[PDB]
Design a binder for this molecule. Structure first.
Ligand SMILES: *[C@@H]1O[C@H](CO)[C@@H](O[C@@H]2O[C@H](CO)[C@@H](O[C@@H]3O[C@H](CO[C@H]4O[C@H](CO)[C@@H](O)[C@H](O[C@H]5O[C@H](CO)[C@@H](O)[C@H](O)[C@@H]5O)[C@@H]4O)[C@@H](O)[C@H](O[C@H]4O[C@H](CO)[C@@H](O)[C@H](O)[C@@H]4O[C@H]4O[C@H](CO)[C@@H](O)[C@H](O)[C@@H]4O[C@H]4O[C@H](CO)[C@@H](O)[C@H](O)[C@@H]4O)[C@@H]3O)[C@H](O)[C@H]2NC(C)=O)[C@H](O)[C@H]1NC(C)=O
Ligand SMILES: *[C@@H]1O[C@H](CO)[C@@H](O[C@@H]2O[C@H](CO)[C@@H](O[C@@H]3O[C@H](CO[C@H]4O[C@H](CO)[C@@H](O)[C@H](O[C@H]5O[C@H](CO)[C@@H](O)[C@H](O)[C@@H]5O)[C@@H]4O)[C@@H](O)[C@H](O[C@H]4O[C@H](CO)[C@@H](O)[C@H](O)[C@@H]4O[C@H]4O[C@H](CO)[C@@H](O)[C@H](O)[C@@H]4O[C@H]4O[C@H](CO)[C@@H](O)[C@H](O)[C@@H]4O)[C@@H]3O)[C@H](O)[C@H]2NC(C)=O)[C@H](O)[C@H]1NC(C)=O
Ligand SMILES: *[C@@H]1O[C@H](CO)[C@@H](O[C@@H]2O[C@H](CO)[C@@H](O[C@@H]3O[C@H](CO)[C@@H](O)[C@H](O[C@H]4O[C@H](CO)[C@@H](O)[C@H](O)[C@@H]4O[C@H]4O[C@H](CO)[C@@H](O)[C@H](O)[C@@H]4O[C@H]4O[C@H](CO)[C@@H](O)[C@H](O)[C@@H]4O)[C@@H]3O)[C@H](O)[C@H]2NC(C)=O)[C@H](O)[C@H]1NC(C)=O
Ligand SMILES: OC[C@H]1O[C@@H](OC[C@H]2O[C@H](O)[C@H](O)[C@@H](O)[C@@H]2O)[C@H](O)[C@@H](O)[C@H]1O
Ligand SMILES: *[C@@H]1O[C@H](CO)[C@@H](O)[C@H](O)[C@H]1NC(C)=O
Ligand SMILES: *[C@@H]1O[C@H](CO)[C@@H](O)[C@H](O)[C@H]1NC(C)=O
Ligand SMILES: *[C@@H]1O[C@H](CO)[C@@H](O)[C@H](O)[C@H]1NC(C)=O
Ligand SMILES: *[C@@H]1O[C@H](CO)[C@@H](O)[C@H](O)[C@H]1NC(C)=O
Ligand SMILES: *[C@@H]1O[C@H](CO)[C@@H](O)[C@H](O)[C@H]1NC(C)=O
Ligand SMILES: *[C@@H]1O[C@H](CO)[C@@H](O)[C@H](O)[C@H]1NC(C)=O
Ligand SMILES: [Cl-]
Length: 968
């Protein structure tokens, strides 16, 4: 329409006139705010065979103050976009404004609680509120469109605009048209794609006003019950997706914009380890190949890398980790078997253009395989080849099943295996069998083993096939050449020539076999060997792989290695690889260019041998360095009381008065004389403090209070210095009604109720019209027994300045309203010389909140990617306490002793300084009259990785400075 770089037909996207299968992973830059590690992730994605990444922008982080857009420093999108270009990864941009994403407010800044209009609607007050954000973020996206030589190819307006309620006329076409025009007006010309939460046809082409260019939808078919990771409920595998697609948007390529790549996990949940078992390699091979059965052309996995909900950016139901059980873990490692499995499928799609031109058929329980226990969905092509996705009919089945295939080919139909034996599908597995598969002019008539990759080189073609252990396979090639075994044993390999073909049968073995037929060499692998193969693009005009264009895809090499192969480039007589290693690794390169005489690995010349088949071999030794981590308990811990409010000399005269008689919140009208909704006064994040002044009659007995901080929140109440009690919190409670007994008060004297409330983050806004993001935080109701409500005059604070937030570098959400946070003591080099020496492991002997500070040096070796973790002990049932940990001023742990489950908190390099000084600031809130302490506090590490990554630059870490706007 508006440009010619990205077009489409009913089958696929075209980029620069060439078909491409978009295989994408979701990655949120705001959850990993270190630019060098962003490149790390992009390179890990590219090594999967993927060509795309989808990303959200979190409005709440970049317009914390209305009218001040700040997407600078750690929030700058431009380095993120340049990292993608550098890695050769296209981008799908999803700036919202509404993103959901398990983020606070679902992306909405807390000041939307004051907007007089329905959120995600055509009400002018909402639309007006979005204009400044979108005109900024969309302009930045516009600058980096592929039309300008950038990486961005698709744009998503809104997010899951799918369900409405409560008076809204859903779907409102005026609303979506407006959101679409905002993007266009900012210079976005690439196609717009939506992500319907279910296949409901919302905003599909042909729906008139508000229609997007390409209809997309989402799917999380395995659900989120991470507690039972082996349970695959009956009927949960989608079977009707192509049918739905042909009804809802037949003129556009089939797109799933969010397909399950993991799961969220709430406070009190089973943990992301369990989620990684549910969405493991078996889920991938069955469910992802099932999406290929619908001829999916655009496929984005949510998430490919989850990262961390640092600095309170997450929604109330989730905790600090957003590991998500995804293929790349929170600490950026790719050890999970699901990464390697995903790599196999991703690399298959990258080299199989006939997949996109084929005609998909209906699934069948007969006619292709000889048992109804199997289901086969065919994708038929004449000249361009066919594809057959095989799985168990009951998809949850762990049975081993013998079968034979009857498949059509250009050479006529054939019953396979022709030479004897049977095929096997073992349990939770799925296969894509191929017929008439083009290996650069050589026709593979059929193969039962799955294709990993193939390449054409100067001295021949190479094809890499794999099967699971215990499987027999067969292939046939259009050729009059015989077959020769050129590596490995000839036993298990059977063969026969016909007049225009050669047929070869084999059993999967842990030992590789290589066979030769004419100029085609075929590697026959087991799945676990195939896991160690890589297909980097080979650059000949620089060091960067470039995007996955057909010419650069064709010019790739095949590398057997270990943990990771990032890049490859040819320079003079040198073949350069960049790779990471977590063990001693034999490296083999297949398809070494004719001109290459030396091998370099990460810039170092590396001895190699050449075997009789022309394969380069080398060894890279892994010798982990001494990692010296300080013992956090032995540091010089400095303590200050960060609840001075409960001492009798505290002066709150500078605090904002909670004196608004009308709320600006449209969702919930006041049930108190003045608003005690935190967001009415610009406080949207972290711990909140309320102070209630009154004069006693002498006859007060109880104080009742309804506090609300979101799921798993807690609160604590004092009358002057006297602790009244706490709500220690439950995931099930987002608010709590408590009645506290008061001590004997003296008639005529003034007293102050101090209330501390944990704001877990603002609610999402999933249903349009419900306005749940407006759910307030703070105090909803109170009753001082025998006194009118107006007897208490309230003051409150959250983060200092509220929306005029102090820390422009670390963002609007990082710090809450504790005295120590207000003063900025959580930053590097606080004024702690005169403070008391006391450790969080000694802790508090009564209810309250302590603030602890210590520095420590690190001196970790260059060239090693070492994941570090903060650990808080929980070996036995603890008393109730809450902890926040700030690392160089950045909050990277929120901990609830009685709820969990997180005890291990990763902190990335860049936030931590691996060769320099670091600062820990710990808040410890005891919700128990007997106080509380940390059982243990430890730094740890996991497998050091010898890495190709460059120096990781430390992000800006502003040191402590006296804040003139503080209340002292
Ligand atoms: C890739 O990235 C991943 C995500 O970033 C990363 O996974 C994370 O790794 C960290 C660090 O290992 C994990 O934290 C640890 O979790 C341990 C508990 O889980 C283990 O045990 C379970 C029960 O059997 C298993 O279910 C579980 O397996 C599952 O999860 C695995 C991933 O971890 C996965 O591979 C499997 O497939 C499976 O799904 C798992 O094996 C926990 O024990 C551990 O705490 C100890 O270690 C800390 C030091 O590092 C201490 O600070 C802490 O106090 C604990 O140490 C104490 O306990 C041990 C005894 O059991 C002793 O060995 C210690 O010396 C110490 O003992 C003292 O204290 C004891 C009291 O507890 C006492 O008994 C002793 O006398 C003594 O006083 C830590 O929390 C985190 O959970 C993982 N996160 C996720 C999302 O998975 C992965 O590591 C990365 N991989 C690589 C290679 O980089
Ligand atoms: C350096 O980097 C390397 C990557 O480049 C990295 O290597 C990778 O390391 C991970 C582990 O961190 C490997 O994944 C594990 O592999 C385990 C071994 O099995 C694999 O290899 C075998 C051959 O050697 C294969 O036969 C095997 O295939 C079989 O099993 C598959 C998976 O179950 C199945 O799909 C196949 O069809 C086939 O049947 C497999 O390929 C593997 O056992 C382990 O699986 C468990 O953990 C996963 C989560 O991490 C789960 O998703 C999975 O379901 C398994 O869970 C079981 O074990 C857990 C304990 O960890 C429990 O929590 C679960 O409840 C469950 O336990 C039940 O069953 C157990 C088995 O009987 C039993 O013990 C329990 O009692 C209970 O009944 C996981 O997939 C990965 O393969 C490696 N990748 C490569 C390329 O090599 C290396 O580790 C890094 N090194 C360092 C030092 O950091
Ligand atoms: C340190 O160690 C200590 C000691 O071991 C750890 O303490 C343990 O922590 C556990 C996890 O927090 C805790 O278990 C929980 O107990 C409560 C009941 O008091 C229960 O609600 C929890 O189970 C639900 O919630 C979790 C998520 O928090 C879900 O994963 C789980 O599936 C359950 O979900 C249900 O309730 C939710 C809230 O209502 C719903 O959203 C959800 O849909 C589901 O609701 C259905 O079922 C409900 C009934 O279960 C029903 O009401 C509703 O109508 C729906 O049908 C979980 O059992 C242990 O009690 C606690 N143990 C001890 C001895 O104290 C501590 O966590 C550790 N700390 C760290 C940092 O690791
Ligand atoms: O990590 C969850 C992820 O969910 C996306 O929607 C979740 C929502 O959508 C499904 O299709 C289905 O309707 C529901 O079961 C499910 O809750 C969301 O778009 C994304 O931002 C994130 O929240
Ligand atoms: C197979 O690939 C070769 C070389 O790329 C090409 O010339 C030919 O058109 C392809 N054949 C088919 C049937 O697609
Ligand atoms: C093809 O090779 C096989 C053994 O690999 C052999 O049995 C057969 O005779 C060969 N065919 C011809 C025509 O040489
Ligand atoms: C919003 O606007 C209407 C019309 O001006 C007004 O009557 C109402 O009081 C407002 N509501 C809130 C919560 O500000
Ligand atoms: C004080 O309170 C008690 C119980 O609330 C009540 O019975 C009594 O009337 C009150 N005394 C005065 C002087 O108001
Ligand atoms: C607390 O009381 C209020 C007002 O009576 C009620 O609306 C709210 O639902 C109650 N909260 C809980 C957690 O029961
Ligand atoms: C209670 O605290 C306030 C200040 O927080 C103080 O001014 C007042 O005198 C205290 N009351 C008593 C009875 O000590
Ligand atoms: Cl202050």
């Amino acid at each position: 329409l508006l440009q010619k770089y990205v077009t489409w037909d009913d089958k696929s996207l075209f980029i620069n006139g060439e078909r491409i299968m978009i295989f994408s992973g979701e990655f949120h830059p705001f959850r990993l705010p270190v630019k060098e590690l962003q490149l790390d992730i992009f390179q890990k994605v590219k090594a999967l065979g993927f060509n795309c990444v989808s990303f959200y922008v979190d409005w709440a982080l970049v317009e914390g103050k209305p009218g001040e857009y700040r997407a600078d420093g750690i929030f700058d999108l431009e380095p993120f976009f340049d990292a993608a270009s550098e890695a050769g990864i296209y981008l799908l941009a999803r700036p919202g404004p509404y993103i959901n994403a398990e983020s606070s407010g679902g992306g909405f800044p807390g000041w939307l609680q004051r907007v007089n209009g329905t959120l995600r609607s055509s009400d002018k007050a909402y639309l007006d509120a979005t204009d400044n954000y979108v005109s900024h973020v969309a302009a930045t996206i516009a600058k980096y469109q592929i039309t300008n030589g950038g990486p961005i190819i698709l744009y998503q307006p809104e997010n899951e605009y799918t369900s409405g309620c409560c008076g809204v006329e859903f779907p409102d076409p005026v609303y979506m048209q407006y959101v679409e025009d905002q993007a266009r007006n900012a210079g976005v010309v690439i196609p717009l794609i939506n992500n319907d939460a279910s296949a409901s046809g919302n905003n599909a082409p042909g729906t008139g006003k508000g229609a997007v260019d390409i209809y997309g939808h989402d799917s999380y078919p395995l659900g989120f019950d991470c507690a039972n990771p082996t349970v695959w409920p009956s009927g949960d595998l989608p079977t009707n997706f192509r049918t739905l697609h042909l009804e809802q948007s037949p003129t556009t390529p089939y797109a799933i914009v969010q397909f399950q790549g993991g799961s969220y996990d709430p406070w009190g949940g089973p943990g992301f380890a369990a989620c990684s078992e549910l969405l493991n390699n078996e889920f991938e091979r069955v469910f992802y190949k099932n999406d290929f059965s619908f001829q999916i052309a655009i496929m984005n996995l949510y998430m490919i890398f989850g990262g961390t909900n640092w600095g309170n950016l997450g929604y109330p139901n989730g905790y600090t980790s957003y590991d998500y059980g995804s293929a790349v873990t929170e600490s950026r490692n790719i050890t999970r078997e699901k990464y390697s499995e995903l790599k196999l499928l991703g690399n298959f799609a990258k080299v199989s253009p006939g997949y996109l031109t084929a005609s998909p058929g209906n699934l069948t329980t007969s006619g292709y395989a000889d048992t109804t226990d199997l289901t086969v969905t065919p994708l038929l092509g004449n000249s361009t080849g066919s594809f057959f996705v095989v799985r168990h009919s009951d998809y949850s089945s762990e049975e081993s099943t013998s079968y034979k295939l009857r498949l059509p080919t250009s050479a006529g139909s054939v019953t396979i295996p022709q030479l004897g034996g049977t095929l096997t599908l073992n349990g939770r597995d799925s296969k894509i069998h191929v017929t008439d598969y083009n290996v650069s002019g050589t026709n593979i008539i059929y193969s039962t083993a799955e294709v990993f990759t193939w390449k054409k080189f100067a001295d021949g073609k190479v094809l890499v096939l794999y099967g699971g252990a215990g499987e027999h396979h067969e292939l046939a090639i259009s050729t009059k050449s015989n077959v020769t075994v050129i590596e490995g044993s000839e036993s298990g390999i059977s063969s026969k020539q016909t007049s225009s073909s050669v047929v070869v049968g084999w059993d999967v073995s842990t030992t590789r076999r290589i066979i030769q037929v004419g100029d085609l060499k075929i590697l026959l692998l087991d799945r676990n060997s195939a896991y160690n193969y890589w297909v980097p693009q080979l650059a000949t005009d620089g060091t960067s792989p470039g995007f996955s264009t057909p010419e650069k895809v064709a010019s790739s090499i095949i590398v057997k290695a270990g943990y990771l192969v990032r890049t490859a480039y040819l320079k003079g007589s040198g073949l350069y690889l960049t790779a990471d290693f977590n063990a001693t690794t034999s490296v083999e390169v297949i398809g070494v260019p004719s001109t290459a005489k030396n091998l370099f690995i990460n810039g170092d010349k590396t001895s190699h041998t050449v075997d009789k088949n022309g394969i380069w071999s080398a060894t890279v030794d892994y010798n982990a360095p001494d990692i010296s981590l300080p013992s956090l308990k032995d540091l010089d811990w400095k303590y200050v009381d960060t609840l001075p409010e409960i001492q009798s000399s505290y002066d709150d005269s500078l605090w904002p008065a909670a004196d608004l008689k009308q709320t600006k919140n449209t969702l919930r009208s006041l049930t108190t004389p003045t608003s005690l909704y935190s967001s009415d006064y610009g406080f949207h994040t972290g711990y909140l403090l309320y102070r209630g002044h009154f004069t006693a009659t002498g006859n007060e007995s109880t104080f009742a209070i309804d506090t609300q901080g979101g799921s798993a929140f807690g609160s604590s109440v004092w009358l002057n210095g006297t602790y009244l009690g706490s709500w220690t919190g439950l995931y099930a409670n987002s608010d709590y009604n408590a009645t506290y007994n008061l001590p004997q008060l003296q008639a005529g004297k003034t007293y102050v109720i101090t209330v501390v409330i944990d704001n877990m983050g603002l609610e999402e806004n999933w249903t349009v019209g419900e306005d749940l993001m407006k759910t307030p935080r703070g105090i909803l109701n109170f009753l001082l027994a025998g006194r009118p409500s107006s007897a208490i005059s309230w003051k409150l604070t959250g983060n200092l300045g509220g929306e005029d937030y102090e820390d422009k570098v670390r963002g609007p959400l990082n710090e809450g309203g504790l005295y120590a946070e207000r003063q900025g003591f959580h930053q590097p080099e606080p004024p702690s010389q005169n403070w008391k020496s006391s450790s969080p492991l000694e802790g508090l002997s009564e209810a309250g909140i302590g603030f602890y500070s210590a520095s420590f040096d690190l001196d970790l070796p260059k060239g090693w990617d070492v994941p570090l973790f903060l650990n808080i002990g929980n070996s036995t049932t603890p008393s109730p306490y809450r902890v926040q940990v700030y690392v160089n001023g950045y909050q990277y742990a929120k901990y609830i002793s009685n709820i969990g489950p997180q005890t291990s908190f990763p902190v990335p390099e860049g936030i931590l300084n691996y060769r320099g000084t670091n600062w820990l600031a710990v808040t410890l809130w005891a919700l128990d009259s007997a106080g509380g302490k940390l059982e243990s506090l430890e730094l740890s590490y996991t497998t050091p990785v010898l890495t190709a990554l460059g120096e990781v630059e430390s992000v800006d870490q502003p040191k402590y400075k006296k804040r003139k706007g503080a209340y002292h």
